[PDB]
Amino acid sequence: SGFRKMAFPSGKVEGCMVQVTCGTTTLNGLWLDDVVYCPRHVICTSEDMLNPNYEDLLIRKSNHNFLVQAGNVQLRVIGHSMQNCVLKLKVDTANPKTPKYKFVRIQPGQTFSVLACYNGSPSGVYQCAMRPNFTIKGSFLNGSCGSVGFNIDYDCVSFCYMHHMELPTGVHAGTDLEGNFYGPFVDRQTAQAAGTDTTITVNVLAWLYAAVINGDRWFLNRFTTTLNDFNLVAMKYNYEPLTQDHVDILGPLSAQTGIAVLDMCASLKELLQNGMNGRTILGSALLEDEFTPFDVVRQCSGVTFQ
Amino acid sequence: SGFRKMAFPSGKVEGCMVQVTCGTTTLNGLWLDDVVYCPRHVICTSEDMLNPNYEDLLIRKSNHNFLVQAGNVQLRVIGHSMQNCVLKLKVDTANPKTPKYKFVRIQPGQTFSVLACYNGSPSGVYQCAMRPNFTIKGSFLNGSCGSVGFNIDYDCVSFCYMHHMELPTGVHAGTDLEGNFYGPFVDRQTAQAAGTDTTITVNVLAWLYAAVINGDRWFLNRFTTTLNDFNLVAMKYNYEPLTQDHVDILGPLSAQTGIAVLDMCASLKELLQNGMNGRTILGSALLEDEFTPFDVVRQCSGVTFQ
Numbered sequence: 001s002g003f004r005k006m007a008f009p010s011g012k013v014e015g016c017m018v019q020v021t022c023g024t025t026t027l028n029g030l031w032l033d034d035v036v037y038c039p040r041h042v043i044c045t046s047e048d049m050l051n052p053n054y055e056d057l058l059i060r061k062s063n064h065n066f067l068v069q070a071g072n073v074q075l076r077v078i079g080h081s082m083q084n085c086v087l088k089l090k091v092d093t094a095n096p097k098t099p100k101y102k103f104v105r106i107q108p109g110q111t112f113s114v115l116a117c118y119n120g121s122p123s124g125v126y127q128c129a130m131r132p133n134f135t136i137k138g139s140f141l142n143g144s145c146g147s148v149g150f151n152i153d154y155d156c157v158s159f160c161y162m163h164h165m166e167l168p169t170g171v172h173a174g175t176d177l178e179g180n181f182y183g184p185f186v187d188r189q190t191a192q193a194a195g196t197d198t199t200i201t202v203n204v205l206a207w208l209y210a211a212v213i214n215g216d217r218w219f220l221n222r223f224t225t226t227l228n229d230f231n232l233v234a235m236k237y238n239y240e241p242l243t244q245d246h247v248d249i250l251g252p253l254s255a256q257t258g259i260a261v262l263d264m265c266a267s268l269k270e271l272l273q274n275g276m277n278g279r280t281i282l283g284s285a286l287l288e289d290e291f292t293p294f295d296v297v298r299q300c301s302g303v304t305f306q
Numbered sequence: 307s308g309f310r311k312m313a314f315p316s317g318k319v320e321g322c323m324v325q326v327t328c329g330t331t332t333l334n335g336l337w338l339d340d341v342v343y344c345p346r347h348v349i350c351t352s353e354d355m356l357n358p359n360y361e362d363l364l365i366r367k368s369n370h371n372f373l374v375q376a377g378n379v380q381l382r383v384i385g386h387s388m389q390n391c392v393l394k395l396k397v398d399t400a401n402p403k404t405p406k407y408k409f410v411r412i413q414p415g416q417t418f419s420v421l422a423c424y425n426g427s428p429s430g431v432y433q434c435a436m437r438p439n440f441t442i443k444g445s446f447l448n449g450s451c452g453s454v455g456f457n458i459d460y461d462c463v464s465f466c467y468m469h470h471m472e473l474p475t476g477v478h479a480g481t482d483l484e485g486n487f488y489g490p491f492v493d494r495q496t497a498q499a500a501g502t503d504t505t506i507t508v509n510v511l512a513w514l515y516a517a518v519i520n521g522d523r524w525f526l527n528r529f530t531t532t533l534n535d536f537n538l539v540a541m542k543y544n545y546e547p548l549t550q551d552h553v554d555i556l557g558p559l560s561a562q563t564g565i566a567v568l569d570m571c572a573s574l575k576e577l578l579q580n581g582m583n584g585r586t587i588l589g590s591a592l593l594e595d596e597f598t599p600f601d602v603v604r605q606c607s608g609v610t611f612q
């Protein structure tokens with residue numbers, strides 16, 4: 001039993017991290033087969049921060065203007081190209097520890113593991129969700145750009161995030177591994193701001209089911225609700241609407257606990273209208289929304305503590 | 307910026323996990339050089355759960371009664387010995403991915419990363435503290451025994467925990483890597499219970515400093531306190547006493563923020579007496595006590611958001 005914010009084991013990704021240097025700028029790259037992926041702002045200077053023209057900056061570079069370092073060996077760049085906001089460096093050496101991998105672009109509300117890296121060296125791993133406003137509440141300092149987010153499925157690593165920037169509220173923004181930003185952000189230091197965020201309703205519900213599976217029932221009640229009436233309450237507390245698709249996704253958790261999805265919605269409505277009254281749920285004093293239904297099934301026992 | 311429960315990268319430990327089988331019982335082992343470490347209760351039967359005599363059970367075994375599996379290769383046991391509550395299996399093959407490592411026994415209030423494993427296969431990583439009552443609030447199911455907890459320092463892995471058992475309240479108990487239990491627990495299914503726990507005061511204070519470093523000051527106040535008067539309040543809220551050693555450990559965080567340790571103690575006292583009043587600190591609605599001062603320094607920027 002127990003329930004923890006659980007990252008995937010990071011070893012398959014640690015073997016892919018390198019250091020990329022252009023000019024005097026250094027950040028992290030992702031080395032897969034004979035290509036190194038990294039944020040294109042590594043070709044910026046201190047002056048090209050406000051409105052850089054990256055196509056113009058890039059045509060001014062040669063292959064030998066880039067330095068790639070894997071551990072304590074240098075990799076020679078033998079070709080380069082820009083793809084959206086990522087740079088791809090073709091290197092003379094295929095990464096021997098390349099895992100089975102995919103590039104995936106995730107939907108808001110999906111979670112992933114982040115391997116924070118500095119100077120090509122992994123420093124930590126934590127679990128993140130893509131917020132509805134397409135930011136992540138990460139932990140990133142200078143030098144962290146090029147750190148990647150990923151999920152792991154049967155030894156296949158699905159890379160879904162590369163880190164590019166921090167917003168004024170302290171949340172983080174970046175791209176898929178093809179260099180497309182999540183959300184409306186761009187990789188320049190012009191005024192940008194995270195939109196208003198909302199709570200990921202389907203994940204709160206999954207997490208309440210986790211709490212039931214682990215033996216805690218105190219927040220349940222005898223009431224039910226309709227999908228429409230729930231969403232009227234959801235809107236009022238800045239929760240995302242719950243769709244029939246979300247209802248169907250919660251199916252297995254409903255079945256293992258015997259609690260119908262809309263019965264758990266009436267529990268959540270009561271928690272929203274009344275608070276927790278000094279109580280905790282799975283050790284938390286607020287409603288957690290960064291566990292997907294898949295995260296709950298992955299970590300919880302398949303037999304509920306009846 | 308940001309602040310997350312951050313585990314160490316787990317790759318160096320993933321390379322050491324194997325599956326150990328004796329009879330029909332299977333659990334996880336730690337493969338370092340030519341020795342596999344695993345909990346001795348792998349030699350138990352369904353009948354030898356209440357009061358097993360492990361010396362008696364073990365003399366009845368041969369080397370060929372143990373099966374060690376690393377990935378999809380079998381390792382042959384060429385020798386065995388019991389050390390406290392761990393079994394050591396000498397194997398014919400030295401682990402080629404053995405990292406630089408140490409065995410360390412940690413004090414209560416220290417944190418570590420846990421690589422949860424099932425059948426020798428890593429499944430997740432999360433961050434734990436050794437509670438003052440020598441339990442950890444982990445996430446462990448059947449099959450998880452032999453999973454290990456560790457810290458990483460300059461590519462040296464310090465193993466500090468091996469998982470053995472769950473207590474009725476859902477918290478977890480285990481040993482150092484020499485097989486000595488943390489706390490008064492024993493590896494048999496006789497009635498045992500976690501003692502009353504207390505909050506790790508020095509860690510709460512470190513975490514308040516993290517919040518200051520990341521730009522949040524709302525909970526500070528103009529007051530100070532003496533060490534003695536703080537601890538009188540600490541006792542009242544089931545917090546551990548703060549020692550002069552704890553004061554000195556918080557030194558660097560005090561210096562980076564300009565907030566004297568005893569001034570932050572007067573802030574904590576106010577938070578304890580008044581609550582948060584609907585506010586959060588680093589996104590949390592309760593006072594977090596599973597970040598050591600060292601954890602804060604490791605993750606936070608060295609320059610405070612003034």
Ligand SMILES: *[C@@H](CC(=O)OCC)[C@H](C[C@@H]1CCNC1=O)NC(=O)[C@H](CC(C)C)NC(=O)[C@@H](NC(=O)OCc1ccccc1)[C@@H](C)OC(C)(C)C
Binds near residue numbers: 191
């Ligand atoms: C990765 C590379 C790096 O370290 O470069 C250092 C010079 C960083 C990761 C950041 C740094 C701190 N935490 C992080 O996650 N990314 C960057 O430095 C970004 C480079 C841009 C060219 C994309 N810049 C920022 O992250 C920047 N944000 C930003 O400018 O947003 C646009 C903006 C919003 C409001 C007002 C003006 C501009 C950060 C560094 O600036 C602050 C003030 C928002 C923190």
Ligand SMILES: *[C@@H](CC(=O)OCC)[C@H](C[C@@H]1CCNC1=O)NC(=O)[C@H](CC(C)C)NC(=O)[C@@H](NC(=O)OCc1ccccc1)[C@@H](C)OC(C)(C)C
Binds near residue numbers: 498
């Ligand atoms: C690891 C090996 C395993 O899976 O064996 C399965 C048969 C597990 C890890 C546990 C299982 C669930 N979550 C975990 O972390 N360890 C064990 O099964 C332990 C083997 C003993 C021989 C040490 N047993 C327990 O963990 C057991 N606790 C226990 O008996 O504590 C003593 C006790 C306390 C009060 C009353 C009676 C006995 C668990 C499985 O039992 C419960 C009821 C406390 C959950």
